[PDB]
């Protein structure tokens, strides 16, 4: 309806659903296959809109597809197309065999090399660089919203909270202090969130701020407290977290700078060899 500006209408005869692999906000998530016009067949994720949906649910469902379809980048989840002319309504995206990054890393605690983790993080930063170039603030950047494929390539997903930079419930643990305080959302608030993702990745999917009260996460961060170095975290990476978490948003790096920093670490792996008693669990500064 509005989604066809940025989404191909797919012929449902080209979609084969293999298995229900999950449950989304708007209906089930399945995996399956898509036959392309060239007769190449690819694996896909298939999201369906629940039977008996409301007009609101349809608009929200397809609206997220409308945003995703605006981006064509190797580190942003690819929209293959939608099915709207038949029901159930569907959103078809590239298949990511290893699922959400946080859940994946929790299964593999301490099992990857620092260079592998840095590769993941560089891909995330590269996708965010493009999203921010396109004028979007994600507002939900978190490891649970990064998907990871069979070759460990990481891709930004979940555009439900995303919006264009122009004149309800928030992911408090991932949100910048200024965005919590007065809804000041900017690409620099996404850079804050990226710092949290960096901590999640280096922590193999530990929950940011563990189970601290939301009120205490807000107060502590505002007072200058920061999540502590993950075990065996390269100094360069902890410093990057701290830079992403600067109180003054103008002092945070841009996504382009983050990509550049990570690229230098990948190119000089010896850099990563320098590795990180306090009066509290969070570290002041």
């Amino acid at each position: 309806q509005t989604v066809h500006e940025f989404a191909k209408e797919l012929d449902a005869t080209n979609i084969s659903i293999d298995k229900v692999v999950g449950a989304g906000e708007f209906g089930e998530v399945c995996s399956g296959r898509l036959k392309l016009p060239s007769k190449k067949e690819i694996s896909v994720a298939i999201k369906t809109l629940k039977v008996g949906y409301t007009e609101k649910q349809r608009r929200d469902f397809l609206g997220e597809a409308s945003i995703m379809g605006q981006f064509d980048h190797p580190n942003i989840i690819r929209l293959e197309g939608v099915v709207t002319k038949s029901k159930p309504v569907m959103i078809v995206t590239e298949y990511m065999e290893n699922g959400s990054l946080d859940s994946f890393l929790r299964k593999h605690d301490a099992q990857f090399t620092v260079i592998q983790l840095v590769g993941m993080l560089r891909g995330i930063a590269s996708g965010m660089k493009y999203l921010s170039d396109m004028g979007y603030v994600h507002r939900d950047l978190a490891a649970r919203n990064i998907l990871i494929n069979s070759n460990l390539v990481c891709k930004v997903s979940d555009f439900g909270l995303s919006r264009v930079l122009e004149d309800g419930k928030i992911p408090i643990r991932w949100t910048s202090p200024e965005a919590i305080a007065y809804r000041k959302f900017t690409s620099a608030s996404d850079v804050w969130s990226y710092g949290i993702v960096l901590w999640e990745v280096m922590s193999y999917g530990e929950r940011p701020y563990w189970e601290m009260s939301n009120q205490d996460v807000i107060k502590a961060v505002d007072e200058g407290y920061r999540l502590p170095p993950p075990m065996d975290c390269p100094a360069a990476l902890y410093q990057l977290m701290l830079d992403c978490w600067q109180k003054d948003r103008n002092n945070r790096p841009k996504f382009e700078q983050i990509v550049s920093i990570l690229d230098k670490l990948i190119r000089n792996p010896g850099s990563l060899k320098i590795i990180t008693a306090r009066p509290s669990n969070l570290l002041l500064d």
Partner: peptide, 8 residues
């Protein structure tokens, strides 16, 4: 999830 909340 307890990941998303209002401020009270």
């Amino acid at each position: 999830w307890d990941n998303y909340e209002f401020i009270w």
